[PDB]
Amino acid sequence: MKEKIALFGAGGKMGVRLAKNLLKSDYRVSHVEVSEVGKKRLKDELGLECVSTEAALDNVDVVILAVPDTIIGKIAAQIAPQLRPGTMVMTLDAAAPFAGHLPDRPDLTYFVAHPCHPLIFNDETDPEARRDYFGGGAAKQSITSALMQGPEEAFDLGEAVAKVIYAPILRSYRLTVDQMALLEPGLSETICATLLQVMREAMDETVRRGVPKEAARDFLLGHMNILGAVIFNEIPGAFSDACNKAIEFGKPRLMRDDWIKVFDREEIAESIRRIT
Amino acid sequence: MKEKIALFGAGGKMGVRLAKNLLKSDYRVSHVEVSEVGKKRLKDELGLECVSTEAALDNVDVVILAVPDTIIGKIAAQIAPQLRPGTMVMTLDAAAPFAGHLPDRPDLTYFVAHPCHPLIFNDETDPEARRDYFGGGAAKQSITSALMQGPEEAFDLGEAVAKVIYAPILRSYRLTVDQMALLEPGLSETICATLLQVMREAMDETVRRGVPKEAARDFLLGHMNILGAVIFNEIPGAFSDACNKAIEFGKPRLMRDDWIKVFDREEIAESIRRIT
Ligand SMILES: NC(=O)c1ccc[n+]([C@@H]2O[C@H](COP(=O)([O-])OP(=O)(O)OC[C@H]3O[C@@H](n4cnc5c(N)ncnc54)[C@H](O)[C@@H]3O)[C@@H](O)[C@H]2O)c1
Ligand SMILES: NC(=O)c1ccc[n+]([C@@H]2O[C@H](COP(=O)([O-])OP(=O)(O)OC[C@H]3O[C@@H](n4cnc5c(N)ncnc54)[C@H](O)[C@@H]3O)[C@@H](O)[C@H]2O)c1
Ligand SMILES: [Ca+2]
Numbered sequence: 001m002k003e004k005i006a007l008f009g010a011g012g013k014m015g016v017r018l019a020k021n022l023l024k025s026d027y028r029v030s031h032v033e034v035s036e037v038g039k040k041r042l043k044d045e046l047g048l049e050c051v052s053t054e055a056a057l058d059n060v061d062v063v064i065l066a067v068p069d070t071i072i073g074k075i076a077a078q079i080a081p082q083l084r085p086g087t088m089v090m091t092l093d094a095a096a097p098f099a100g101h102l103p104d105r106p107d108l109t110y111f112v113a114h115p116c117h118p119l120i121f122n123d124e125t126d127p128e129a130r131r132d133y134f135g136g137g138a139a140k141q142s143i144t145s146a147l148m149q150g151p152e153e154a155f156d157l158g159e160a161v162a163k164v165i166y167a168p169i170l171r172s173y174r175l176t177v178d179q180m181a182l183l184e185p186g187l188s189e190t191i192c193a194t195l196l197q198v199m200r201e202a203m204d205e206t207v208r209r210g211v212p213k214e215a216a217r218d219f220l221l222g223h224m225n226i227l228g229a230v231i232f233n234e235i236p237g238a239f240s241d242a243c244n245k246a247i248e249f250g251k252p253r254l255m256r257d258d259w260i261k262v263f264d265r266e267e268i269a270e271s272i273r274r275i276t
Numbered sequence: 277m278k279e280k281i282a283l284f285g286a287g288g289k290m291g292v293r294l295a296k297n298l299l300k301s302d303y304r305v306s307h308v309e310v311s312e313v314g315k316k317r318l319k320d321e322l323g324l325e326c327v328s329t330e331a332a333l334d335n336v337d338v339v340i341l342a343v344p345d346t347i348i349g350k351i352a353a354q355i356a357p358q359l360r361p362g363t364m365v366m367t368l369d370a371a372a373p374f375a376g377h378l379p380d381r382p383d384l385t386y387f388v389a390h391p392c393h394p395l396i397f398n399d400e401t402d403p404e405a406r407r408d409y410f411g412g413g414a415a416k417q418s419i420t421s422a423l424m425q426g427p428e429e430a431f432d433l434g435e436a437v438a439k440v441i442y443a444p445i446l447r448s449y450r451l452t453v454d455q456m457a458l459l460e461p462g463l464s465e466t467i468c469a470t471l472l473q474v475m476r477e478a479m480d481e482t483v484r485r486g487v488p489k490e491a492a493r494d495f496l497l498g499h500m501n502i503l504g505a506v507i508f509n510e511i512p513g514a515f516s517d518a519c520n521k522a523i524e525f526g527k528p529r530l531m532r533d534d535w536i537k538v539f540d541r542e543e544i545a546e547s548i549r550r551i552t
């Protein structure tokens with residue numbers, strides 16, 4: 001038996017995934033969930049019963065707040081007076097921690113752990129791993145963690161828990177909370193999600209103009225494969241002169257000249273205000 | 277034995293791939309290559325000897341111009357007087373045909389066939405197929421073809437050849453040359469290549485700012501997997517409110533408001549002028 005964990009939001013989207021992976025470890029886990037629906041999922045899918053806050057917090061080592069980001073501060077403030085010095089409070093996302101929503105408690109340990117998801121270019125032999133897009137099922141994924149406050153020794157404990165809840169694991173990285181914020185919302189959402197949206201809009205426009213729907217989808221997804229594999233150095237190669245010409249003109253044609261300033265601290269901080 | 281094919285540019289990047297796949301069919305093929313280097317590749321890799329134009333064109337049914345797009349017109353003009361009515365001249369790209377570079381010969385058949393490449397989201401059981409990014413090796417790919425001129429019956433012949441040179445095949449679509457031009461340069465190069473470039477630039481910027489290099493790469497490529505799979509309906513699901521918020525603000529933050537006008541005919545035509 002290892003440390004005691006209290007999992008709040010245990011019946012939510014991340015809650016049930018964590019509960020499922022924690023059942024396969026030696027951690028002692030108490031599950032806290034307010035919704036009937038979530039309590040039912042836990043019961044039906046995992047055979048787990050939920051307990052009260054007081055029961056969950058009794059001799060707790062690690063508190064995982066798998067609750068929405070907009071209420072991490074509120075929930076942390078409710079429970080913090082029950083937490084002894086040296087208890088770890090762990091979030092699964094850097095937003096609420098970055099925004100300064102966690103309690104003013106220098107004596108607590110604050111840890112964030114966010115998954116990468118399985119790589120788009122991967123050679124999972126297991127077909128079931130090839131179809132695990134999210135991670136935490138069969139395909140390996142890298143993780144990113146930050147020790148925001150606490151002793152250096154607590155990093156190891158937080159990282160161990162992270163490796164269990166997100167298993168199976170590829171690589172495990174240590175970052176700061178500021179770096180985590182550059183990654184998300186900055187890189188994965190402001191950049192990646194928006195530009196995939198644009199690609200889908202472009203695809204839809206060629207279909208509007210009469211390209212068969214499935215043809216446009218195959219063409220885009222196949223060119224994304226080869227182009228992405230080269231640009232991201234998954235394989236050797238170099239773009240043809242034609243492709244470079246397209247980027248040459250395509251950059252100023254599509255993009256605002258100041259697009260990369262999304263990574264400025266003021267812009268990152270504002271993106272986090274909007275979702276907290 | 278089936279139709280006779282003359283493969284020009286037989287020792288180039290596409291030439292050797294086509295030669296390799298045509299060796300596994302019943303087509304009778306003559307190979308024409310001007311460079312010593314290319315003649316050597318054919319000889320060494322495939323055991324094939326090259327022949328003269330005159331020999332290659334004698335009783336030819338299909339001429340494949342696997343030569344650079346900037347000289348398809350010139351090369352087609354050189355050889356066209358040797359081609360009898362009803363001979364197919366086939367290109368592997370829509371650019372030179374769209375630009376009107378092919379000879380003024382109403383009596384010839386003009387056919388374009390361009391591959392999709394293997395889909396970025398695929399469940400190839402064969403690991404060797406999982407690592408074929410380009411296509412024409414082990415992984416299946418969809419193809420797009422156009423009969424630009426000639427009788428309806430010639431489509432079938434062109435498509436058969438296309439299925440052999442690009443094998444193995446997923447789906448085979450029939451398009452117009454105008455539609456092919458929307459797909460490339462429009463969708464795959466002006467859009468897709470440019471936006472992957474932007475994603476790589478963003479990734480590089482988070483590394484400049486201190487994110488570990490491999491962490492940034494894993495994070496981006498893993499989020500591309502899950503986000504792309506949802507946006508392109510490879511799996512069910514819907515973006516969280518946070519992710520939608522990022523796109524909401526991200527679209528006007530990153531993109532020129534007129535970006536989708538790249539698909540206007542004038543812009544497509546100009547993109548093709550630059551590469552022909
Ligand atoms: N969904 C994702 O893809 C994803 C990926 C990585 C990280 N995360 C992070 O996971 C965390 C949770 O997100 P989610 O998507 O699972 O949210 P969710 O809305 O699906 O689940 C939240 C759960 O918290 C419960 N809850 C609300 N108030 C509570 C309380 N006072 N006490 C106990 N439980 C309470 C809800 O009833 C619900 O079951 C967030 O920090 C989010 O950013 C989410
Ligand atoms: N490379 C790609 O990824 C790709 C993908 C799909 C389609 N295509 C299309 O394939 C065609 C050929 O492109 P490539 O990348 O193979 O080019 P390449 O430059 O690699 O090969 C061209 C070959 O043509 C030969 N050649 C030049 N002049 C010739 C002549 N007068 N007679 C005979 N041979 C001659 C060259 O010596 C060379 O070996 C183009 O239409 C291109 O758009 C290329
Ligand atoms: Ca987030």
Ligand SMILES: [Ca+2]
Binds near residue numbers: 242369371460461
């Ligand atoms: Ca092209």
Ligand SMILES: [Zn+2]
Binds near residue numbers: 114115188
């Ligand atoms: Zn994320």
Ligand SMILES: [Zn+2]
Binds near residue numbers: 223390391460464
């Ligand atoms: Zn292409």
